[PDB]
Amino acid sequence: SSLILLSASDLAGQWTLQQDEAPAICHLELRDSEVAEASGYDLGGDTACLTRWLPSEPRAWRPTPAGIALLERGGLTLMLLGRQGEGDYRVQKGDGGQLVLRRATP
């Protein structure tokens, strides 16, 4: 019963996605709530715009010890974002589009 629930927290904040080769930005919100259905944290914000870079709309995400992962509320990881630089994650996907998650600076 002493299990630590509120784990990741400094990750909370605002973030955005950037798809290269395809001018289009999307506001993303990394929630800090716990989610056992996907074993991660909720994913509010416009996740719909991801229906073009992911096979399903991610309702949750799970930070891994080597990058961020997006889930669909079932445990099926949709994409593994690798940390390229503290606050700069990038992933290679077919089609030729580069996603970039960076804390909303503006």
PDB file of C-alpha atoms in Angstrom:
ATOM      1  CA  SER A   1       0.000   0.000   0.000  1.00  0.00           C
ATOM      2  CA  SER A   2       3.070   2.265   0.242  1.00  0.00           C
ATOM      3  CA  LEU A   3       3.722   1.883  -3.504  1.00  0.00           C
ATOM      4  CA  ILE A   4       4.800   5.244  -4.968  1.00  0.00           C
ATOM      5  CA  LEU A   5       1.960   6.413  -7.243  1.00  0.00           C
ATOM      6  CA  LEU A   6       2.771   9.967  -8.394  1.00  0.00           C
ATOM      7  CA  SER A   7       6.061   9.002 -10.085  1.00  0.00           C
ATOM      8  CA  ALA A   8       7.081  11.077 -13.130  1.00  0.00           C
ATOM      9  CA  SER A   9       6.144  14.732 -12.504  1.00  0.00           C
ATOM     10  CA  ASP A  10       8.864  17.096 -13.783  1.00  0.00           C
ATOM     11  CA  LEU A  11       7.722  15.852 -17.211  1.00  0.00           C
ATOM     12  CA  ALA A  12       4.368  17.631 -16.795  1.00  0.00           C
ATOM     13  CA  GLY A  13       4.070  20.840 -18.852  1.00  0.00           C
ATOM     14  CA  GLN A  14       3.159  21.821 -22.432  1.00  0.00           C
ATOM     15  CA  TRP A  15       4.755  20.374 -25.581  1.00  0.00           C
ATOM     16  CA  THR A  16       4.335  20.429 -29.370  1.00  0.00           C
ATOM     17  CA  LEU A  17       5.040  18.088 -32.316  1.00  0.00           C
ATOM     18  CA  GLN A  18       6.843  18.989 -35.570  1.00  0.00           C
ATOM     19  CA  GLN A  19       6.556  16.838 -38.716  1.00  0.00           C
ATOM     20  CA  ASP A  20       9.299  17.642 -41.261  1.00  0.00           C
ATOM     21  CA  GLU A  21       8.705  17.146 -45.008  1.00  0.00           C
ATOM     22  CA  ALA A  22       5.100  18.025 -44.064  1.00  0.00           C
ATOM     23  CA  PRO A  23       4.420  21.567 -42.705  1.00  0.00           C
ATOM     24  CA  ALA A  24       2.026  20.908 -39.798  1.00  0.00           C
ATOM     25  CA  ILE A  25       2.301  21.518 -36.023  1.00  0.00           C
ATOM     26  CA  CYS A  26       0.156  20.090 -33.199  1.00  0.00           C
ATOM     27  CA  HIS A  27      -0.207  21.231 -29.571  1.00  0.00           C
ATOM     28  CA  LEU A  28       0.276  18.290 -27.173  1.00  0.00           C
ATOM     29  CA  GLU A  29      -0.338  18.078 -23.392  1.00  0.00           C
ATOM     30  CA  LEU A  30       1.561  15.545 -21.267  1.00  0.00           C
ATOM     31  CA  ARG A  31      -0.682  14.863 -18.246  1.00  0.00           C
ATOM     32  CA  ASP A  32       0.912  13.683 -14.967  1.00  0.00           C
ATOM     33  CA  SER A  33      -2.034  11.485 -13.927  1.00  0.00           C
ATOM     34  CA  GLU A  34      -1.381   7.745 -13.486  1.00  0.00           C
ATOM     35  CA  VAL A  35      -3.051   5.255 -15.870  1.00  0.00           C
ATOM     36  CA  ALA A  36      -3.043   1.502 -15.132  1.00  0.00           C
ATOM     37  CA  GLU A  37      -5.121   0.656 -18.230  1.00  0.00           C
ATOM     38  CA  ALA A  38      -2.003   1.511 -20.277  1.00  0.00           C
ATOM     39  CA  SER A  39       0.496   1.566 -17.407  1.00  0.00           C
ATOM     40  CA  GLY A  40       1.431   5.181 -18.214  1.00  0.00           C
ATOM     41  CA  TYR A  41       0.045   8.747 -18.047  1.00  0.00           C
ATOM     42  CA  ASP A  42      -2.947  10.291 -19.866  1.00  0.00           C
ATOM     43  CA  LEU A  43      -2.418  12.283 -23.100  1.00  0.00           C
ATOM     44  CA  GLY A  44      -4.775  15.279 -23.433  1.00  0.00           C
ATOM     45  CA  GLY A  45      -4.567  17.902 -26.213  1.00  0.00           C
ATOM     46  CA  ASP A  46      -5.140  17.402 -29.947  1.00  0.00           C
ATOM     47  CA  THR A  47      -4.113  13.775 -30.377  1.00  0.00           C
ATOM     48  CA  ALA A  48      -6.269  13.545 -33.480  1.00  0.00           C
ATOM     49  CA  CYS A  49      -3.621  15.263 -35.650  1.00  0.00           C
ATOM     50  CA  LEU A  50      -1.535  12.155 -34.888  1.00  0.00           C
ATOM     51  CA  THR A  51      -3.911   9.932 -36.906  1.00  0.00           C
ATOM     52  CA  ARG A  52      -1.439  10.687 -39.733  1.00  0.00           C
ATOM     53  CA  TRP A  53       1.749   9.665 -37.876  1.00  0.00           C
ATOM     54  CA  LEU A  54       0.220   6.889 -35.728  1.00  0.00           C
ATOM     55  CA  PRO A  55      -2.231   3.998 -36.474  1.00  0.00           C
ATOM     56  CA  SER A  56      -4.545   5.067 -33.615  1.00  0.00           C
ATOM     57  CA  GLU A  57      -5.197   8.177 -31.496  1.00  0.00           C
ATOM     58  CA  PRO A  58      -2.920   7.886 -28.369  1.00  0.00           C
ATOM     59  CA  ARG A  59      -4.921   8.420 -25.174  1.00  0.00           C
ATOM     60  CA  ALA A  60      -1.903   7.672 -22.959  1.00  0.00           C
ATOM     61  CA  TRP A  61       1.918   7.548 -23.017  1.00  0.00           C
ATOM     62  CA  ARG A  62       4.592   5.704 -20.971  1.00  0.00           C
ATOM     63  CA  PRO A  63       8.060   7.315 -20.395  1.00  0.00           C
ATOM     64  CA  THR A  64      10.734   4.622 -20.937  1.00  0.00           C
ATOM     65  CA  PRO A  65      14.304   4.696 -19.487  1.00  0.00           C
ATOM     66  CA  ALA A  66      15.558   5.604 -22.985  1.00  0.00           C
ATOM     67  CA  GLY A  67      12.812   7.624 -24.716  1.00  0.00           C
ATOM     68  CA  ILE A  68       9.046   8.304 -24.610  1.00  0.00           C
ATOM     69  CA  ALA A  69       6.395   5.795 -25.779  1.00  0.00           C
ATOM     70  CA  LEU A  70       2.811   6.498 -26.927  1.00  0.00           C
ATOM     71  CA  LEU A  71       0.025   4.018 -26.031  1.00  0.00           C
ATOM     72  CA  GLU A  72      -3.619   3.727 -27.190  1.00  0.00           C
ATOM     73  CA  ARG A  73      -5.164   2.822 -23.792  1.00  0.00           C
ATOM     74  CA  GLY A  74      -4.561  -0.918 -24.284  1.00  0.00           C
ATOM     75  CA  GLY A  75      -0.800  -1.392 -23.775  1.00  0.00           C
ATOM     76  CA  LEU A  76      -0.099  -1.419 -27.532  1.00  0.00           C
ATOM     77  CA  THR A  77       2.865   0.965 -27.910  1.00  0.00           C
ATOM     78  CA  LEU A  78       2.247   3.082 -31.028  1.00  0.00           C
ATOM     79  CA  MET A  79       5.647   4.817 -31.297  1.00  0.00           C
ATOM     80  CA  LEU A  80       8.888   4.997 -29.280  1.00  0.00           C
ATOM     81  CA  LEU A  81      10.246   8.571 -29.267  1.00  0.00           C
ATOM     82  CA  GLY A  82      13.995   8.445 -28.542  1.00  0.00           C
ATOM     83  CA  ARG A  83      15.520  11.283 -26.510  1.00  0.00           C
ATOM     84  CA  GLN A  84      18.074  12.952 -28.793  1.00  0.00           C
ATOM     85  CA  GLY A  85      18.852  15.769 -26.333  1.00  0.00           C
ATOM     86  CA  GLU A  86      17.263  16.713 -22.950  1.00  0.00           C
ATOM     87  CA  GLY A  87      14.070  18.328 -24.330  1.00  0.00           C
ATOM     88  CA  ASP A  88      14.548  17.106 -27.907  1.00  0.00           C
ATOM     89  CA  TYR A  89      13.156  13.705 -28.934  1.00  0.00           C
ATOM     90  CA  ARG A  90      13.066  12.479 -32.543  1.00  0.00           C
ATOM     91  CA  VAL A  91      11.899   9.278 -34.254  1.00  0.00           C
ATOM     92  CA  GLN A  92      12.233   7.924 -37.812  1.00  0.00           C
ATOM     93  CA  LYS A  93       8.970   6.794 -39.469  1.00  0.00           C
ATOM     94  CA  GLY A  94       8.129   5.594 -42.998  1.00  0.00           C
ATOM     95  CA  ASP A  95       6.603   8.109 -45.439  1.00  0.00           C
ATOM     96  CA  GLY A  96       9.673  10.278 -44.736  1.00  0.00           C
ATOM     97  CA  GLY A  97       8.347  12.405 -41.835  1.00  0.00           C
ATOM     98  CA  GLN A  98      10.419  13.381 -38.773  1.00  0.00           C
ATOM     99  CA  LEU A  99       8.495  14.028 -35.560  1.00  0.00           C
ATOM    100  CA  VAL A 100      10.027  16.341 -32.937  1.00  0.00           C
ATOM    101  CA  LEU A 101       8.630  16.768 -29.392  1.00  0.00           C
ATOM    102  CA  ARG A 102       9.965  19.890 -27.623  1.00  0.00           C
ATOM    103  CA  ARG A 103       8.510  21.737 -24.610  1.00  0.00           C
ATOM    104  CA  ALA A 104       6.333  24.543 -26.022  1.00  0.00           C
ATOM    105  CA  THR A 105       8.933  27.328 -25.750  1.00  0.00           C
ATOM    106  CA  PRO A 106       6.553  29.997 -27.163  1.00  0.00           C
TER     107      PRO A 106
END
